[PDB]
């Protein structure tokens, strides 16, 4: 199928997002960029961190199999290079919705300039304590001026499509979202099935972004911006560095169906206050 159209477009989205806030970090900390990749998966963003020229990376995921794949991909990157430097990394298996990551870090008092949480944080909204815990994990160890960036389904788009659907499901040939019931969107535990054909079929939880925003305040976070994937793309392609990067990473235009899948998402970035 066309899995890698969406995969690579989404990776271009993450690269533009990561690149933007790495540049904002580097405008101050050219010294020792430290990044928490929360829900790193199998390490899809390792290369972006390598190109970002960061110094330390904590890769953590709930799936141990994915963390070890992340570790292996990292060691493969490290084991050969045109380059001479590459960030150091630690790899932590953990439910960042239930466990304190500082309990696992090599260095507990370490601080991050960026916590990147790409397509992960909505799993934290099973419950308030889990949503709070993931925020704490993403944000508590952020240095003042550090960034909490991520991508997560846009609850408005999900709900809008749900209310517009004649059923509790919606989607196309590429993806299906099924809510358990309609009109019942609890702050937490609002579960729905997300099926991305050939990619993932996993239950997710509605993240009402104003709720995520309010909750980030508890960790001295302020929203830098929230952008739908449409807003973000339409804005970011205007910069032709981003455009060319999309031509190099992408496999061609997204299909209407792919864009329908991708458009459920939003990009967000918060900054740790002084
Ligand atoms: N509670 C939790 N804590 C840590 N990671 C979680 C999690 N719930 C889900 N995940 C992870 O979130 C990831 C979602 S897929 C996104 C992976 C990666 N960030 C990327 O952009 O490619 C998966 O790897 C999954 O294992
Ligand atoms: O583009 C991405 C990142 C990506 C794409 C292909 S592999 C990583 N997205 C959007 C759709 C779902 C992805 C997702 N969520 N949960 C997952 N679990 C397992 C595997 C994938 C998972 C996140």
């Amino acid at each position: 199928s066309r899995i890698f159209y969406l995969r690579n477009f989404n990776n271009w989205m993450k690269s533009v997002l990561i690149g933007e806030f790495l540049e904002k970090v580097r405008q101050k900390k050219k010294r020792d960029i430290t990044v928490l990749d929360l829900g790193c998966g199998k390490g899809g963003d390792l290369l972006k961190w390598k190109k970002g020229r960061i110094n330390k990376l904590v890769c953590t995921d709930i799936a141990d199999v994915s963390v070890k794949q992340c570790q292996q991909r990292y060691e493969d990157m490290k084991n050969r290079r045109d380059s001479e430097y590459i960030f150091s990394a630690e790899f932590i298996t953990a439910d960042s919705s239930k466990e304190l990551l500082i309990d696992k870090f090599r260095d507990p008092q370490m601080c991050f300039d960026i916590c990147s949480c790409q397509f992960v944080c909505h799993y934290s909204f099973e419950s308030y304590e889990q949503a709070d815990m993931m925020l704490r994990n993403a944000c508590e160890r952020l240095s003042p001026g550090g960034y909490f960036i991520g991508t997560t389904p846009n609850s408005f788009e999900l709900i809008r499509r749900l209310e517009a659907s004649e059923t509790e499901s919606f989607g196309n040939e590429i993806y299906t979202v099924k809510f358990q019931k309609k009109g019942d969107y609890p702050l937490f535990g609002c579960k729905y099935d997300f099926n991305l054909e050939g990619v993932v079929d996993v239950p997710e939880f509605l993240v009402y972004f104003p709720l995520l925003n309010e909750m980030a305040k508890k960790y001295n976070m302020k929203l830098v911006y929230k952008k739908t994937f449409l807003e973000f793309y339409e804005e970011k392609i205007k910069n032709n560095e981003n455009k060319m990067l999309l031509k190099r990473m992408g496999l061609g235009c997204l299909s209407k169906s792919e864009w329908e899948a991708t458009s459920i998402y939003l990009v967000f970035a918060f900054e740790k206050q002084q």
Side-chain angles (χ1 to χ4, degrees), residues 1-29 32-79 83-84 86-274:
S1 188
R2 289 170 51 109
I3 47 164
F4 289 104
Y5 278 82
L6 250 193
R7 182 182 161 290
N8 298 9
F9 174 88
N10 280 352
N11 272 310
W12 167 81
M13 292 280 286
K14 292 189 294 168
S15 318
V16 175
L17 176 61
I18 283 155
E20 176 189 347
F21 289 91
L22 271 182
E23 171 63 15
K24 296 194 163 264
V25 170
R26 262 194 314 267
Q27 286 166 7
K28 319 159 220 183
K29 262 196 52 150
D32 225 28
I33 309 190
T34 313
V35 180
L36 174 67
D37 204 324
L38 200 284
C40 65
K42 301 166 198 329
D45 291 346
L46 288 171
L47 191 51
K48 305 175 183 64
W49 301 126
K50 186 190 157 37
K51 313 265 131 193
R53 286 186 226 90
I54 78 165
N55 300 98
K56 307 233 316 168
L57 177 65
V58 187
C59 287
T60 191
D61 204 280
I62 193 173
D64 184 72
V65 169
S66 293
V67 176
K68 298 207 190 326
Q69 293 172 257
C70 192
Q71 185 153 9
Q72 187 58 79
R73 157 142 49 168
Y74 166 73
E75 295 171 357
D76 294 4
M77 291 177 62
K78 173 126 61 72
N79 258 278
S83 89
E84 277 304 279
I86 177 176
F87 57 85
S88 57
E90 32 182 319
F91 304 79
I92 303 177
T93 297
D95 179 348
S96 291
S97 87
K98 306 190 192 290
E99 300 166 64
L100 254 290
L101 291 184
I102 40 80
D103 292 356
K104 245 79 78 215
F105 292 157
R106 276 200 188 148
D107 182 358
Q109 312 288 322
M110 89 177 291
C111 293
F112 301 100
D113 307 286
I114 300 162
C115 169
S116 173
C117 178
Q118 305 302 328
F119 309 108
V120 173
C121 72
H122 47 293
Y123 301 111
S124 76
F125 278 68
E126 176 171 5
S127 75
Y128 167 79
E129 62 266 25
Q130 287 170 271
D132 186 34
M133 174 67 79
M134 189 168 289
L135 283 178
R136 176 183 295 275
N137 274 330
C139 300
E140 98 178 311
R141 304 309 309 172
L142 275 179
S143 301
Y147 298 104
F148 168 43
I149 62 183
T151 49
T152 199
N154 177 355
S155 81
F156 168 77
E157 196 52 35
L158 291 180
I159 297 324
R160 190 193 70 63
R161 295 183 192 187
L162 182 64
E163 303 285 357
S165 168
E166 290 168 69
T167 68
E168 297 74 29
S169 293
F170 60 88
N172 51 32
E173 93 258 28
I174 290 183
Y175 86 100
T176 306
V177 166
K178 175 162 57 66
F179 281 69
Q180 90 276 199
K181 183 173 100 223
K182 199 167 294 196
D184 183 14
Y185 318 122
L187 301 179
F188 306 97
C190 181
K191 205 216 258 177
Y192 62 89
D193 290 302
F194 180 60
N195 185 6
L196 187 50
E197 209 68 68
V199 175
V200 70
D201 200 350
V202 63
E204 308 190 333
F205 297 97
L206 197 61
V207 182
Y208 189 60
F209 190 84
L211 173 68
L212 170 66
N213 182 67
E214 187 64 34
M215 287 178 67
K217 292 175 171 176
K218 166 169 166 181
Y219 303 102
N220 204 25
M221 306 299 297
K222 67 92 181 196
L223 180 69
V224 169
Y225 64 70
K226 158 206 77 145
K227 292 177 179 138
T228 62
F229 265 32
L230 173 48
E231 298 176 329
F232 191 83
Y233 163 83
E234 280 187 338
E235 181 187 323
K236 292 304 183 167
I237 41 160
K238 279 175 178 166
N239 165 270
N240 316 262
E241 269 73 28
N242 299 344
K243 195 182 321 263
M244 292 308 295
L245 184 53
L246 177 43
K247 308 308 128 209
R248 291 192 307 276
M249 261 170 325
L251 308 170
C253 301
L254 287 188
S255 73
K256 164 156 168 287
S257 49
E258 275 150 13
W259 178 251
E260 278 173 10
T262 338
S263 51
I264 74 170
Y265 296 103
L266 65 74
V267 300
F268 61 82
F270 303 79
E271 179 177 3
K272 174 81 84 172
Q273 287 314 90
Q274 45 277 6

